[PDB]
């Protein structure tokens, strides 16, 4: 499923993401936009370490979800990577929350550092009623 901007903003809010571990909805929106363009079936294979980034948040198979084919991998979110390819983003959100529970927080995603950190992200949630 490819979300419309405000549709995703409200969906994320209803899932308890606003202010989760101090992260605003606009930050989550900026992350999703740059990671997958709001596409829940987005995937990216990384030839370098043979891992795959899954879904709307591009969560990596080497550490967060299990896909069976990633060499020397763990599954911190305790989910099949398939769960990160559903139109319903509840499971992906549960995992994204697990990621930010770590020290780095939202900084766990490099894309957030390059495209959202210290940026004016108001535009991601303006007019969405969140």
Q: Using the 3D structure, state the CATH architecture.
A: Orthogonal Bundle
Structural class: alpha+beta
Count of beta strands: 3
Write the element-wise H/E pattern from the N-terminal end onward: HHEEEHH
Counted by DSSP, the helix tally is 4
Using the alpha-carbon principal axes, give the shape.
globular
Helix content: 25-40%
Major sheet: size, sense and barrel closure? 3 strands, antiparallel
Number of domains: 1
* Oligomeric category: monomer
Sheet with most strands: strand arrangement: 1-2-3
CATH class: Mainly Alpha
CATH topology: Lysozyme
Q: First CA to last CA: what distance?
A: 21 Å
Structural Rg = 14 Å
What amount of the residues lies in strands?
5-15%
How would you sum up this structure, described in words?
The chain has four helices and three strands; from the N terminus they run ααβββαα. It is an alpha+beta fold and 130 residues long. It has one domain (1-130): Lysozyme. Strands 1-2-3 form a three-stranded antiparallel sheet. Strand 2 and strand 3 (59-60) form a beta hairpin. Helix 1 (5-14) crosses helix 2. The radius of gyration is 14 Å and the shape is globular. Pfam families: Lys. Residues 1-130 form the C-type lysozyme domain. It catalyses: Hydrolysis of (1->4)-beta-linkages between N-acetylmuramic acid and N-acetyl-D-glucosamine residues in a peptidoglycan and between N-acetyl-D-glucosamine residues in chitodextrins. It is found in: Secreted.
